Design a protein around this ligand. Sequence first.
Ligand SMILES: *O([C]1[C]([O])[C]([C]OP([O])(=O)OP(=O)([O-])O[C][C]2O[C]([N+]3=[C][C]=[C]C(C([N])=O)=[C]3)[C]([O])[C]2[O])O[C]1N1[C]=NC2=C1N=[C]N=C2[N])P([O])([O])=O
Ligand SMILES: NC(=O)c1ccc[n+]([C@@H]2O[C@H](COP(=O)([O-])OP(=O)(O)OC[C@H]3O[C@@H](n4cnc5c(N)ncnc54)[C@H](OP(=O)(O)O)[C@@H]3O)[C@@H](O)[C@H]2O)c1
Lengths: 364, 364
Amino acid sequence: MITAQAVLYTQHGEPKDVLFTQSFEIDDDNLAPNEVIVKTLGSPVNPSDINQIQGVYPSKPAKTTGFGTTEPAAPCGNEGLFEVIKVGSNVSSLEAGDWVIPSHVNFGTWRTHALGNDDDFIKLPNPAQSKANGKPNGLTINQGATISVNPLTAYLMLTHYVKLTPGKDWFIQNGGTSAVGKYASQIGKLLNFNSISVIRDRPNLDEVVASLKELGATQVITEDQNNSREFGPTIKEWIKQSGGEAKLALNCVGGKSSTGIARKLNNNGLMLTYGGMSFQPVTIPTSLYIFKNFTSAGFWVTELLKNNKELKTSTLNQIIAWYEEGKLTDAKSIETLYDGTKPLHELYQDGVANSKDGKQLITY
Amino acid sequence: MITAQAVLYTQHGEPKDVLFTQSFEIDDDNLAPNEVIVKTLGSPINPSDINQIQGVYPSKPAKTTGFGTAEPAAPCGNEGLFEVIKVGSNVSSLEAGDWVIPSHVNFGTWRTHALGNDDDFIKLPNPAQSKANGKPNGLTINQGATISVNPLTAYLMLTHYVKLTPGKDWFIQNGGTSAVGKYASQIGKLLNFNSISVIRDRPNLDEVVASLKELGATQVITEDQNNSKEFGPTIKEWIKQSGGEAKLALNCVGGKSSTGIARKLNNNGLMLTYGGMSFQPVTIPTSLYIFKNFTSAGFWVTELLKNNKELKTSTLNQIIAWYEEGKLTDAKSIETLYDGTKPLHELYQDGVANSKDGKQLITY
Ligand SMILES: *O([C]1[C]([O])[C]([C]OP([O])(=O)OP(=O)([O-])O[C][C]2O[C]([N+]3=[C][C]=[C]C(C([N])=O)=[C]3)[C]([O])[C]2[O])O[C]1N1[C]=NC2=C1N=[C]N=C2[N])P([O])([O])=O
Ligand SMILES: NC(=O)c1ccc[n+]([C@@H]2O[C@H](COP(=O)([O-])OP(=O)(O)OC[C@H]3O[C@@H](n4cnc5c(N)ncnc54)[C@H](OP(=O)(O)O)[C@@H]3O)[C@@H](O)[C@H]2O)c1
């Protein structure tokens, strides 16, 4: 028998208040024929995971007593990389040593182990398999553990809604230092799209601007520049020189930031709102709608891919291939290793509290 | 001392999610004068038990800490057969070895043992007692465990409301393959009432028709036939040939099915609704109320027998006698035995999930 740990809550609220660790038992002897046991290698903290715990995210796992609690409790985390440790006698899709992610949301990835079927998982090539299949690179644990939400989100927003002419057209995005922002910049570079990333000013501004330009942002501006009527004509010059148009805006901030990036689009522009990193609503001047034919819409990768498994597979395959080819790198995570001395839920609580420092990955 | 197990929940929800098993101690060396300890022999899973756990049934046991839980918890199950194992110094009505059912609802029968007062139980004859009293049969465990709700429901609906003339009048009922339905057909035969059972179509329709007819249904029709304008005159022919009238409809379905059985009654008809599938409301054409003196009412055995021990006693005694005489038969339960190797709540969760296979009885 394996003794596992899961991060659970019995009631919605802030992670600092409601999370605890539950020890539970998994039977790793005498597997059913289709069953698969996996050990976690790592799982990140994404905003969606936190919103799920807070109760403001309408897709969530059921509260159950299945982890051996008396009160119904929900697990946490939708994304993660797991190593297959044992498979049942009718399992050929997976074997010991294989890398997998969950095939569906609401799996509960903030935990040490899981028992499911082979259809609960999607296989990723492990480094040994990538090299054997003649690839110059294999995935890292961070790359595998964060492959499923943010890279697909960036890829689909940039490709699935409006067609940007390679070598000419632009997108503009706020939250430029976000993991999603960093994938968008790289995917923009790979597809030959011009882009403007908007970021908050900070003391190490120059270092950040350089990182983002290296990733693929054509220009990086601050939110102060975004707000600036004086600066607008400079952006117009860039776009005019390119021969192209700013056709797409990606908004994960809301408020004034959403106003600023919308104003920078050419007529007939599209904005996709995929997040709201301050509680501020999407705010658009009436004149953009009426006089510039602006359109504002939403994006939600979970809903988009629900009955679109071909689209999911195709997108994921492209990200894997790019990683194997050395053409894509990961939005880097701050890693915290679980080793048994500090309760698992506290690692995640610290991760939630240190969100501002950057993407957090709990490792195992 | 006795280490017992109870199936409990701290919060309402689906049985698959909220049930757990709680160990608790009964001190069998510390009985008060009027107290009795019983060992469960068997308890079924009925829809009302499930609705209770889900939180949509307005009669339910209180949540308490009495089973030694940290948080308040409620037990499950309303019906069951128990064996008296020990009685207090002032108990005369029961002795060790006796068979009993709960005297009242909300007792919590999904558990191994209970401590209660002598008046929390009603004695049934055990097989040794039936045999000693000159009876050709004694009750089976399934018969005793399911005697409290369904048989009594059928008998009272048939006899307590409208007086059917033996050898000529008719009742019509839907849910004809239900436990209640099957008891009603038998009681109809025993009292010489004609009846029409309405059932859903199924692959072995003809085989089921024949079984229901053997039980006592005069005629059996599908829901399609119940709906059918074409078929309706055939039913009128049956009733006219008998010299009697259709005076009573028993409804456990609602919706179109309820409309159809109501339309088949003669003037001055009474419908009793005792259940309802798919949340479909009871739907009765206005014309029947106005022009055919139709009445529609409810039946709930829990409420009818709440303050009427004498009617309960007389009815229960008739059912017992019929079992002893070999005049009534139960539908075959699927029995799952608790031996202490699989948690008790999981046996009941399986039974809930497997409801469609047949009535589920957990035995001990
Ligand atoms: O500015 C902040 C960061 O740029 C950014 C957050 O970065 P992150 O890496 O921690 O978060 P990500 O995992 O990339 O994603 C966060 C947002 O995107 C939404 N999202 C992601 C994927 C899929 C969906 C979807 N709909 O399919 C949605 C998610 O809900 C998040 O909203 O935020 C910036 N930030 C923080 N506070 C800000 C702010 N910008 C402006 N104003 C305020 N108050 P930094 O680098 O710290 O300065
Ligand atoms: N008010 C009361 O005093 C009281 C007391 C006892 C029972 N009841 C009611 O009676 C019913 C269950 O009694 P039971 O223990 O006899 O149950 P049961 O043995 O499990 O039988 C259930 C019946 O419901 C039928 N059914 C299921 N879904 C249906 C649907 N969608 N449309 C039409 N019929 C459907 C089944 O038909 P199939 O065989 O085709 O699947 C079967 O005949 C419940 O509605 C319950 O609330 C009420």
